[PDB]
C-alpha cells in the first residue's frame, strides 16, 4: 500500500526554535509511517550513532512508539550523550540508562541558532543535591544551598543559582558552536507496534 | 563544616562567567586594534573597566575560605591565585596616587621631545629620527649629543616620581606578608608542593648568578675582538687595554648589538644567505608564506590549523584608509578563537616572524583543555623560548634548500658558516650580561641595601665591571640612567628576558639529542622528525597544572637550570676565536676613562 500519514519528522528536524537542555524538549510520535532513509543518507548530520539496532536493520523491525528528545548543546558535549558517562549533561540535565535503545543524531547549526550579539536564550543546569534518575526532567529553579548558612532564597556568601546561560556567537571556534541534538527512544510495550517502514512493488 | 569540597562548587561557578567576560574583553580589544575610530575606543574601555571591577568581588569572597586546611594540591593552587588581594590593600588615597604616578610616568616617557642646539625648534622623537641617529650612522659628535640629550632631558625629570613610587610599592608588597618587593617578582618562580621538586627565592638568587660564571670565556674573547676591531675602525679613540664607550654600541642602551654586523664583518666579500630576490621571483605572496610555515609544524606532529584561522585573521596590510597597528601579535580570544595580526611584507625577516607567531599560536592551543585559571605558560619564559626555537630551526640552510629557495649546488663552507654564526653571536650572548646587571641593580634598589645617595654612583660603578662600559662624561647623582628604558616605567618583569635564552638552547640540545643527526650544534635540525614531536608535546600540554620543575622532565632529565648548551652551540666560533685574539690582551681595566 502506497505511503500515507507520514510521521512529522519535518517539524522536529526543521523547527523554528529549540528549547534549552535543562527543560529538554519532548515529543511523542506514534501511529504513522516513518522513513529513516532520508535521515541516514543526508550529508548534513555530523553524528549519527547507536548500538542496539544497526542503521540498515532499522527499517526491518519496528516498535510501539517513539520519543523524540530535542535540545541544543555545545560542541564537545555531543559525545557526552552516551550510557554510563559523567559530566554536567549526562548527570544533572539529561540521564541515559545503561540499557538504552534508539539513538542519537547531532548536527551543526551555527548559521541558524547563533547571533552576533550573543544568544542568551539558552541555559543549562550546573548544581543539584542529588543526581538525575534515568529519563527524568526537572524544571524547578529553587535557590541553591551550599553550606549550613540558612539562605531565604537570596544570593550572598555561599548560596548559589542552578542555571547558567550560554554564550553562543558566530566567531566562536569549532567545539563551542551550538550543535542541535535529537535523540530517538523506541518503546516495545505489549500493545501493537505502530511506526515503521514501507513495502516495495 | 567541610571546607575542602565547598571550594570546588565556587570554582565551577567562577570559571563559567570568567570565560565569557574575558572573551568579551578580548573581542573588544581586537575590534579596536584592527579598526580604530572615535566610536570603537570608549566601548573597549566600557568592557575593560567592567572586567577589572569584576575581579574585586570574586577576590573579596575568596578570603572566607580558610586556606590552611585545604589538602588537594590543584584546588589549593587554584585558590592561591584568587586570594591575591591586589592593589586595594592600602587606603584609597594611596592607591589613587600610585595609579596617578604610574600614568604620569608613562605619559612623560611617551612625550619625548628634544631639539637640536642649532635649531631650537627642530625636535626629533623616538620614532624614526633620533633613534636612527645612533643606529645607522658614522659620526661621533651627533651620537654623543643625542645620548646626552636623551639621558639629561628624559630620566633626570623622572627621578623624583620613581623615588616615591619605589617606597610606596615596597610597603604595598610588605602588606602581603613578604620581606621585600623583589620577592613578589620572584613569586612566580616559587613552588611549594611535592618534595624534591620545591623551589625557594633564595635558591633562585643563588642559582641565576651561579649559571653566569661559566660563560666568561665566551664573553671575554668577544669583548676583546670587538674592541680591537672598533679601535682599528676608529683611530686613537679606544685604549688597547681599557673599556669601550657607551655611544658606539649601536642602540640607546646597548640591549642589542645586531647593528654592528656591517662594520665588523670578517669575510666581507663572502655574501650572506639572502633569498629576497628568490622569494620575489615566483610570487611569494602573503598567504602561501604562512601556508608553508604551517607545514613545518604539521610535519613534526603538532596539530593542524583550525578552519577559521584563515578567515578572521588580518594577515596582510589593511589597505589605505583603515588605520591599524603593525606590531606582530598572536591573539587568543578564547573559546576556540585564535587570530594573528601583523603587517606583512615579502622579506625573510617577516618569514621568521611568521614562524615565531605560529609557534606562539601552537603553544597557546596546546593547553586549551585546562581550567581557566591555569591557561598560562608554566612560567614567564616558556612562551618566548618556544617562540624562538622554531625560528632557530627554520633558518638552517638545509631546510631552505629543501623548500627550494636556494640553488641545489650551494657551496656552504667554513668561511660563510663562521660569518653566519657571528651574526647570531652578537645578538644572544650580547644581551645576557646587561640583563643580569640591570636585574641585579633593580633587586638591590628594592631591597633597600643602598641609601638615598648610592643610586647613580653604583649603577655605572658595577656596569664597568659586569659589561665593560665606561662613563663618556662624568655625572652627578641628579641623573637617573635606567629610567630611560621601556620596562622600567611600565613596571614589567625583566628577568624573563634572561632565563628564556638559556631555556631555548637546553631544549635545542635535548631536541638535538633526540635528533640522531651528526654535525656541529649550529646545523642541527628538528624538521622531518616524529621522534622530536612527542617529547615536546608531553610538555606543551601541561600548562600551569604541574610545577615547572616537572615540566622540565619530559624534555631534559636534569630538573636544575644549568648552562650546558651556551658553551656548546658556540663551540666552533670560540675555538676559532682563540686563534683570532692571539696578540690582544683580554680583559678590561676600569681606570681609563674619556675624561681621565
Ligand atoms: C583534586 O581534585 C581534582 C578534581 O576532583 C582531582 O581530579 C580528579 O581526580 C580523580 C582521582 O582523584 C581522577 O579520577 C579524575 O580523572 C581527576 N579529574 C577529574 C576532572 O575528575 C584531583 O585528583 C585532586 N587531587 C588530589 C586529590 O590530590
Ligand atoms: C585581603 O585584605 C583583607 C583586609 O585588608 C584581609 O583580611 C584581614 O587579614 C588580616 C591578616 O592578619 C586579619 O588580621 C584581619 O582580621 C582580616 N580582616 C578581614 C575583614 O578579613 C585579607 O586577609 C587579605 N587577603 C589575604 C589573602 O591575606
Ligand atoms: C622530508 O623532507 C622532504 C624534502 O622536502 C619531503 O619530501 C618532499 O615532499 C614533497 C611533497 O610533500 C614533494 O613535492 C617533494 O618533491 C619532496 N622532496 C624530496 C627531496 O623528496 C618530505 O615530505 C619530508 N617528510 C615529511 C614526513 O614531511
Ligand atoms: C494509492 O494508489 C491508489 C491507486 O494507485 C489510489 O487510489 C490511492 O489513493 C493511493 N493512496 C494514496 C494516494 O494515499
Ligand atoms: C528541512 O528543510 C530542508 C529545506 O527544504 C529540506 O531539504 C529537508 O529535507 C527538510 N528536512 C525535514 C526532516 O523535513
Ligand atoms: C571600521 O569602523 C568604521 C567606524 O564605525 C566603520 O564605518 C567601518 O565600517 C569599519 N570597518 C569594518 C570593516 O567594519
Ligand atoms: C589538518 O590536517 C589534518 C591531517 O592531515 C587533516 O585531517 C585536516 O583535514 C586538516 N585540516 C584542514 C582544515 O585542512
Ligand atoms: C676551514 O677550516 C678547515 C679546517 O682546517 C680548513 O681545511 C679549510 O681550508 C677552512 N676553510 C677556508 C680557509 O676557507
Amino acid at each position: 500500500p502506497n505511503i500515507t500519514n507520514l510521521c512529522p519528522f519535518g517539524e522536529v528536524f526543521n523547527a523554528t526554535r529549540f528549547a534549552s537542555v535543562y527543560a529538554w524538549n519532548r515529543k511523542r510520535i506514534s501511529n504513522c509511517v516513518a522513513d529513516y532513509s532520508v535521515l541516514y543518507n543526508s550529508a548534513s548530520f555530523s553524528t549519527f550513532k547507536c548500538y542496539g539496532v544497526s542503521p540498515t536493520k532499522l527499517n526491518d523491525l519496528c516498535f510501539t512508539n517513539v520519543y523524540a528528545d530535542s535540545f541544543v548543546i555545545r560542541g564537545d558535549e555531543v559525545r557526552q550523550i552516551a550510557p554510563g558517562q559523567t559530566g554536567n549533561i549526562a548527570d544533572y540535565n539529561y540521564k541515559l540508562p545503561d540499557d538504552f535503545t534508539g539513538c542519537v543524531i547531532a548536527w551543526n547549526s551555527n548559521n541558524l541558532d547563533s547571533k552576533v550579539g550573543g544568544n542568551y536564550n539558552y541555559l543549562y543546569r550546573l548544581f543539584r543535591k542529588s543526581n538525575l534518575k534515568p529519563f527524568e526532567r526537572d524544571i524547578s529553579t529553587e535557590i541553591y544551598q551550599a553550606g549550613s548558612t540558612p539562605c531565604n532564597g537570596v544570593k550572598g556568601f555561599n548560596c548559589y543559582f542552578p542555571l547558567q546561560s550560554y554564550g553562543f556567537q558566530p566567531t566562536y571556534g569549532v567545539g563551542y558552536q551550538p550543535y542541535r541534538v535529537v535523540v530517538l527512544s523506541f518503546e516495545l510495550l505489549h500493545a501493537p507496534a505502530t511506526v515503521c517502514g514501507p513495502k516495495k512493488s | 563544616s567541610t571546607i575542602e569540597e565547598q571550594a570546588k562548587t565556587f570554582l565551577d561557578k567562577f570559571n563559567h562567567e570568567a570565560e565569557d567576560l574575558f572573551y568579551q574583553s578580548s573581542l573588544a580589544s581586537w575590534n579596536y586594534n584592527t579598526n580604530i575610530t572615535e566610536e570603537n575606543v570608549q566601548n573597549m574601555n566600557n568592557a575593560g573597566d567592567k572586567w577589572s571591577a569584576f575581579l574585586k568581588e570574586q577576590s573579596t569572597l575568596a578570603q572566607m575560605y580558610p586556606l590552611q586546611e585545604i589538602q588537594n594540591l590543584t584546588v589549593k593552587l587554584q585558590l592561591q591565585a584568587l586570594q591575591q588581594n591586589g592593589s586595594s590593600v592600602l587606603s584609597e588615597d594611596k592607591s589613587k596616587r600610585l595609579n596617578t604616578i604610574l600614568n604620569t610616568m608613562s605619559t612623560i616617557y611617551s612625550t619625548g621631545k628634544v631639539c637640536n642646539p642649532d635649531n631650537p625648534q627642530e625636535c626629533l622623537l623616538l620614532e624614526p629620527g633620533l633613534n636612527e641617529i645612533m643606529a645607522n650612522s658614522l659620526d661621533y659628535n651627533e651620537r654623543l649629543w643625542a645620548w646626552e640629550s636623551w639621558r639629561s632631558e628624559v630620566g633626570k625629570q623622572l627621578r623624583p616620581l620613581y623615588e616615591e613610587y619605589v617606597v610606596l610599592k615596597n610597603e604595598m608588597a610588605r602588606a602581603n606578608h613578604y620581606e621585600d618587593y623583589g620577592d613578589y617578582w620572584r613569586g612566580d618562580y616559587e613552588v611549594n608542593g611535592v618534595d624534591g621538586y620545591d623551589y625557594s627565592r633564595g635558591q633562585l638568587i643563588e642559582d641565576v648568578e651561579h649559571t653566569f660564571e661559566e660563560i666568561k670565556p665566551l664573553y671575554e674573547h668577544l669583548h676583546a675582538y670587538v674592541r680591537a676591531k672598533l679601535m682599528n675602525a676608529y683611530p686613537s679613540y679606544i685604549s688597547p687595554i681599557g673599556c669601550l664607550p657607551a655611544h658606539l654600541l649601536g642602540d640607546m642602551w646597548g640591549r642589542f648589538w645586531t647593528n654592528l654586523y656591517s662594520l665588523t664583518v670578517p669575510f666581507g666579500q663572502k655574501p650572506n644567505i639572502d633569498v629576497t630576490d628568490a622569494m620575489v621571483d615566483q610570487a611569494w605572496d602573503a598567504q602561501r608564506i604562512f601556508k608553508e610555515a604551517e607545514k613545518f609544524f604539521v610535519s613534526v606532529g603538532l596539530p593542524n590549523m583550525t578552519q577559521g584561522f584563515w578567515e578572521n585573521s588580518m594577515l596582510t596590510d589593511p589597505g589605505n584608509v583603515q588605520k591599524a597597528v603593525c606590531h606582530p601579535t598572536a591573539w587568543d580570544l578564547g573559546k576556540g578563537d585564535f587570530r594573528i595580526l601583523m603587517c606583512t611584507k615579502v622579506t625573510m625577516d617577516d618569514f621568521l616572524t611568521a614562524h615565531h607567531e605560529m609557534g606562539h599560536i601552537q603553544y597557546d592551543m596546546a593547553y586549551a583543555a585546562q581550567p581557566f585559571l591555569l591557561r598560562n605558560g608554566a612560567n614567564e619564559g616558556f612562551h618566548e623560548a618556544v617562540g624562538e626555537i622554531m625560528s632557530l630551526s627554520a633558518a638552517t640552510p638545509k631546510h631552505l634548500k629543501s623548500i627550494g629557495l636556494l640553488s641545489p649546488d650551494f657551496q656552504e663552507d667554513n668561511e660563510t658558516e663562521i660569518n653566519f654564526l657571528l651574526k647570531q653571536a652578537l645578538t644572544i650572548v650580547g644581551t645576557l650580561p646587561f640583563t643580569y646587571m640591570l636585574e641585579k641593580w633593580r633587586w638591590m634598589v628594592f631591597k633597600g641595601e643602598i641609601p638615598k645617595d648610592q643610586w647613580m654612583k653604583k649603577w655605572w660603578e658595577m656596569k664597568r665591571e659586569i659589561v665593560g662600559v665606561v662613563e663618556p662624561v662624568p655625572h652627578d647623582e641628579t641623573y637617573c640612567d635606567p629610567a630611560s628604558l621601556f620596562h622600567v616605567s611600565n613596571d614589567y618583569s625583566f628577568i624573563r628576558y634572561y632565563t628564556r635564552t638559556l631555556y631555548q638552547f637546553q631544549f635545542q640540545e635535548a631536541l638535538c639529542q633526540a635528533a640522531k643527526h651528526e654535525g656541529p650544534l649550529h646545523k642541527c635540525d628538528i624538521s622531518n622528525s616524529t621522534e622530536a614531536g612527542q617529547k615536546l608535546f608531553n610538555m606543551l600540554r601541561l600548562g600551569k597544572s604541574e610545577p615547572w620543575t616537572l615540566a622540565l622532565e619530559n624534555v631534559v632529565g636534569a630538573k636544575n637550570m644549568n648552562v650546558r648548551p651556551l658553551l656548546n652551540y658556540f663551540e666552533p666560533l670560540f675555538t676559532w676565536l682563540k686563534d683570532q685574539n692571539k696578540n690582544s690582551f683580554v680583559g678590561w681595566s676600569t681606570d681609563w676613562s674619556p675624561y681621565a
Side-chain angles (χ1 to χ4, degrees), chain A residues 117 120 124 126-127 144 146-148 156-158 160-161 163-167 169 171-174 176, chain B residues 1 6 9-13 16 19-20 23-24 27 61 64-65 306 312 334-337 339 368 375:
Chain A
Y120 280 6
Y124 68 113
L126 211 47
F127 297 135
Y144 187 73
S148 66
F157 172 37
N158 276 341
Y160 285 43
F161 208 67
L163 309 180
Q164 317 302 313
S165 54
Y166 278 143
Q169 268 175 65
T171 58
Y172 275 8
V174 65
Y176 279 69
Chain B
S1 58
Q6 65 183 357
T9 69
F10 171 56
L11 286 172
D12 267 329
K13 172 60 169 160
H16 164 52
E19 262 183 20
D20 180 278
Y23 177 84
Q24 303 284 40
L27 189 49
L61 280 72
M64 293 180 183
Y65 302 123
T306 81
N312 318 124
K335 300 244 168 177
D337 211 5
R339 289 174 210 204
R375 266 93 67 85

Side-chain angles (χ1 to χ4, degrees), chain B residues 185-204:
Chain B
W185 275 347
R186 304 188 289 265
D188 203 318
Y189 279 157
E190 264 181 90
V191 57
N192 268 16
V194 189
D195 192 2
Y197 283 174
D198 61 346
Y199 210 85
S200 61
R201 293 192 296 268
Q203 180 164 337
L204 191 43

Side-chain angles (χ1 to χ4, degrees), chain B residues 23-33 40 43-45 47-48:
Chain B
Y23 177 84
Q24 303 284 40
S25 159
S26 294
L27 189 49
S29 286
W30 165 261
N31 290 318
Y32 162 70
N33 264 27
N40 200 3
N43 63 6
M44 182 179 72
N45 312 124

Side-chain angles (χ1 to χ4, degrees), chain A residues 5 23-24 29 49 53 56 76 82 88-89 91 93 96 98-99 112 126 161 170 175 200:
Chain A
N5 211 11
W24 49 275
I29 307 291
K49 308 194 319 301
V53 178
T56 62
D76 68 299
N88 304 307
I89 298 300
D91 189 359
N93 292 262
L96 270 189
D98 215 349
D99 59 29
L112 282 72
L126 211 47
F161 208 67
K200 326 280 165 294

Side-chain angles (χ1 to χ4, degrees), chain B residues 30 290 309 313-315 329-331 338-342 357:
Chain B
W30 165 261
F290 275 96
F309 168 85
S313 79
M314 202 285 268
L315 288 153
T329 44
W331 289 88
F338 308 107
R339 289 174 210 204
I340 179 181
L341 192 142
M342 150 178 170
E357 295 309 309

Side-chain angles (χ1 to χ4, degrees), chain B residues 161-422:
Chain B
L161 288 179
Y162 204 71
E163 184 178 358
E164 298 260 352
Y165 157 65
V166 167
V167 301
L168 183 63
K169 207 170 195 307
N170 191 38
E171 190 277 331
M172 183 278 288
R174 282 176 186 170
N176 270 325
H177 317 287
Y178 283 140
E179 65 166 3
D180 202 34
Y181 182 34
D183 47 16
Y184 186 28
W185 275 347
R186 304 188 289 265
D188 203 318
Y189 279 157
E190 264 181 90
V191 57
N192 268 16
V194 189
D195 192 2
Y197 283 174
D198 61 346
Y199 210 85
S200 61
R201 293 192 296 268
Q203 180 164 337
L204 191 43
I205 299 172
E206 192 63 29
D207 185 41
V208 70
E209 59 88 20
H210 178 272
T211 189
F212 170 74
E213 285 182 358
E214 275 89 359
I215 77 163
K216 295 321 293 172
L218 191 163
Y219 179 69
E220 283 204 341
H221 272 103
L222 263 173
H223 192 284
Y225 161 74
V226 163
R227 198 186 61 221
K229 253 191 168 171
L230 183 62
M231 158 291 294
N232 289 318
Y234 292 165
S236 294
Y237 263 59
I238 310 171
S239 46
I241 197 53
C243 53
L244 73 165
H247 299 351
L248 296 174
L249 275 296
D251 291 331
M252 301 215 87
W253 318 269
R255 209 195 159 202
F256 278 164
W257 295 14
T258 187
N259 302 316
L260 297 199
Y261 184 11
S262 299
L263 201 67
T264 62
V265 64
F267 299 124
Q269 177 51 248
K270 270 64 200 185
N272 203 32
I273 309 309
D274 188 41
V275 293
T276 306
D277 53 71
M279 271 295 268
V280 161
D281 170 77
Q282 58 269 16
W284 274 105
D285 51 353
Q287 187 169 3
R288 65 193 292 247
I289 286 186
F290 275 96
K291 257 188 172 290
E292 190 277 331
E294 177 207 277
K295 277 320 271 182
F296 180 84
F297 290 84
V298 168
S299 84
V300 182
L302 294 174
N304 191 10
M305 291 325 317
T306 81
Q307 176 215 346
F309 168 85
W310 302 112
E311 305 174 357
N312 318 124
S313 79
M314 202 285 268
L315 288 153
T316 180
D317 180 73
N320 188 284
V321 76
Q322 286 195 3
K323 284 91 191 194
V325 295
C326 294
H327 199 57
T329 44
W331 289 88
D332 73 21
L333 306 170
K335 300 244 168 177
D337 211 5
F338 308 107
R339 289 174 210 204
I340 179 181
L341 192 142
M342 150 178 170
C343 295
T344 184
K345 287 180 175 292
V346 182
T347 76
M348 71 156 78
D349 305 332
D350 288 322
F351 195 62
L352 303 190
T353 311
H355 268 257
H356 182 102
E357 295 309 309
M358 191 56 48
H360 263 294
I361 286 294
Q362 267 285 0
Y363 189 82
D364 269 330
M365 199 180 317
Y367 53 87
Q370 304 289 329
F372 167 72
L373 271 165
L374 302 187
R375 266 93 67 85
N376 296 115
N379 59 5
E380 281 98 356
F382 268 21
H383 280 273
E384 268 293 321
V386 164
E388 292 84 4
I389 281 166
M390 306 290 157
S391 187
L392 286 192
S393 296
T396 61
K398 168 183 301 304
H399 184 88
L400 296 152
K401 179 161 278 193
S402 173
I403 70 170
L405 212 58
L406 273 77
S407 59
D409 301 336
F410 204 75
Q411 191 175 3
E412 279 295 88
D413 56 356
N414 183 335
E415 319 195 333
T416 177
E417 271 303 328
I418 286 172
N419 206 359
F420 155 75
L421 202 52
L422 167 56

